[PDB]
Symmetry: C5
Subunit: 238 residues, 5 copies
């Protein structure tokens, strides 16, 4: 049950941590690599009490990245401790740590001021699938966005939501509030079985006025496939 709570409640920290495997990892015998895989698996299980970790194969879809973790935790200290432990494991020691981003899941700022019919649609349940594609786009707003008053921003977000609703059927979403914890304002996360829909979703959004206030849109756009840890690591132990 508590797994659900970290994935849906407000006040939960979400961290996105990317990694790439050193060339010299293959110089290890295959035996060593499988023992190393074992260690990592154990570490994750030991932390399963305090935090939830999900894995993604970025290798072959995202540039300069093999593995990503999405870690949910009630305090970032625990995430620190886990990631430090992880990077210390023998597998971890052969990993070049890529990007790292943090944000807190929060209660919605503009949605209360939307129409009632638009609130119903947002409550509708979309993509419920295993092994979907996963996308992460960090976002930074311009100065102009903050200078706007609440009514203006609420209007712009309503246009945003309107453009995107049709795609809630096949695309799942989650928003993290990132300001002050790194160099972006939000982290956006998505799961979909249909990449061409996701493409059309992003295209629809590029046409709303709100879009021009995204001072940073991507860089990087992370694309991968959701997968259990064992399957990912197994690739490397062969």
């Amino acid at each position: 049950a508590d797994r659900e709570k970290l994935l849906t409640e407000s006040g939960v920290y979400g961290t996105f941590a990317t990694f790439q495997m050193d060339h010299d990892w293959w110089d290890l015998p295959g035996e060593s690599r499988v023992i190393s895989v074992a260690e990592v698996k154990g570490l994750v299980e030991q932390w399963s009490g305090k935090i939830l970790v999900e894995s993604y194969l970025l290798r072959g879809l995202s540039d300069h990245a093999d593995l990503m973790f999405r870690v949910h935790a009630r305090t970032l200290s625990d995430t620190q401790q886990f990631l430090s432990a992880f990077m210390g494991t023998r597998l971890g020691r052969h990993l070049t740590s890529g990007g790292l981003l943090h944000g807190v899941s929060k209660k919605p700022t503009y949605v209360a001021g939307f129409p009632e019919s638009m609130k119903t649609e947002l409550q509708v349940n979309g993509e419920s699938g295993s092994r979907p594609y996963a996308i992460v786009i960090p976002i930074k707003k311009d100065a102009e966005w903050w200078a706007l008053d609440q009514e203006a921003r609420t209007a712009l977000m309503q246009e945003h939501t309107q453009a995107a609703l049709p795609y809630l059927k096949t695309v799942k979403k989650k928003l993290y509030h990132s300001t002050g914890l790194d160099d972006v304002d939000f982290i956006t996360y998505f799961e979909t079985e249909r990449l061409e829909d996701f493409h059309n979703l992003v295209r629809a959004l590029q046409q709303v006025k709100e879009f021009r206030h995204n001072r940073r849109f991507g860089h990087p756009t992370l694309l991968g496939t959701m997968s259990p840890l064992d399957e990912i690591l197994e690739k490397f132990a062969q």
Copy 2:
């Protein structure tokens, strides 16, 4: 036959993947390097059922890049699997993965709203040559482009098309729709025997109004020569 379908149909994913060879690859004896070349060849043939892979020599033409693949696949998960397997082969283990870009081949958005005479010319068959030069330019449009209405954009694309038609005789083209799959909106790909013509084509297009809406033009501009995999890898096995 099916080869043609991947290269021409809509809904096919095209991935562009560049690589550079580690200094330490030459520390291997020449025998090891020829065995490794054999591995890679086999892997490509094994995947020949599900995806089409084409190779280009970037070495000596594109900075910080030796090899590029253009991979066509009906699903990006298969491209992932292939590239992951590839990067794992002995040869793959000595390659530093450069850029990686994806886009879907789609049905034309503005071409129906062009004049009939302009539609005839666009259907005309241009460069049919082996071992041609190949160019890849990623493109990102500005906010202002999306804010325009459909009629304005159609107008601007018609100007684009009119500027470029004369060059269809000696330059082949293909457009991939990239938004949401990485940090660019389109990936453009070109084959030509005459680089001087391609130069004059890009020069003609810098003069149309549409051009100023390319927030990102190149970076990198990839230039190479199309070539069978065996020839390219054989260079490295000597």
Copy 3:
């Protein structure tokens, strides 16, 4: 006592120095690594006469960074000597020097020209806690900022102060005057037990007019946990 003087007086240089550990550090036997940890410890104690050094675990919270020092000194030459010595120790030789930033603690330029009631609040003592989160944001102002007259800038800083006072309860702060000693105008430093409050503080400040004059805001935003040196280094000696 004199520890306090360095952390509170004007004319004290604060230097911020980030580091990341080489992959090849783990090729050393665990014995060697414990020896090396000993060395660094000693060097820090030796310099404890002249300068104060504080340590932060960036590992797992800040991208491409494992350790940060905040060094206080009355002359930057001493900081130079200490950092140079540190980088020479065996542990130091396996560290890739990340960013480096300096600024001087100075007497306040605008605060005399604020209201009396606003001066009371600024004097009030906030976060007094061990092992808190620590954030560093380097800042560069635009040309327009400097072109403003004193009255205008004072007005804008009063707005900044007003927005931020409520957060003095749970967030500690320190300002360093960096201009001329590197490529930023200010280094901002913060300690907090409550990241969510820090987030809301930076969000409140993004809405004051002063904010649009930050030509550089972050890049990098350094996030970590304050910790004694032996705990941090101990992680690496295992």
Copy 4:
């Protein structure tokens, strides 16, 4: 004779290729390094039928660069083959490939529409010296430049030419048309015995209106001394 044709005719490709020598090159015994020098020398001679290669010592004058080649070829394929071969030689294998740029020598676009007296001066023969300094500045024009009509651009280039004529006495020049082959529009190349004159030339040019249309000016500005290959490589074989 044919050497002249490549350096003066239109339709000749000029490639600019920079390299830096790996630290571990000195770990080779001095014998090995002289044998390697021999290899490279021979390769250049073997290609002397199809292409012209000239060498420059960038070491000590241009940052992060030791050697530059200026290669002239009637087809870029041949330059590819040569540079690939070169990078493969033992000396080549210890070189980190810096930048790489291409452009075609072309017949002048605006000079026919200049006054007759200004055409006379442009025909006059300037710097005829061995071992001169060499400068390469890549250039990218802004959108605005292309949007101008021919008459406006011709007018601006006439101002450019006028400002720079006095310096034709001591500064030799050549222009390569680079658009579409990489990320710059032009490659500018210069030889001079008098760097202070070159300085004053570039100063004179920063004052003409055309200058503000250079979206990219330099980055890098390459400075070196022209020298035969054997002299340059000899430095490294010691």
Copy 5:
């Protein structure tokens, strides 16, 4: 005597060359390192006829840099030859060459058009001290700056000079004209015993109108301590 002439006359080239020491330098035994130090010292003395070289400890004050040389020479060829020789010594072979910049010392452009009382002050002798701090800021002016007419620029530089004169007492200065020799227009160099004064000097200058025409200001800002070569290298031979 002639030492003065290089440091004061017009037409002398000044080159700024920064270096960082390889990790693997400390794998050498301490004997080898002191022999290496001897080599470099000798080379400098051998070139003492033709050029003047001054050293700065950048380690611990400037990021990614240990050593800087300021070389004065009547011709840049001689600087090239020296720096090449230097990089070739055993010490030199374990150095990663950082930035490199050149400029010529020239007669003042605007000073003749200043008031007489302002000319008197500029003649006054300021900081005469051994082992001072040294700062280098490269500067590139915007297009706008060049488009101004002489009278406008002279006006702006008089404001610049007025702002700065009070600091001539404690800060020594030198200007190198860099355009065409690299990617910047000027190289500014400063010596001071009082960094806090230098800070206030740069702050006073950020408020004059001229300052908004500095398209590039720093990047890097190099900060170090002036010191004899033997002291600096001795640190490394321990």
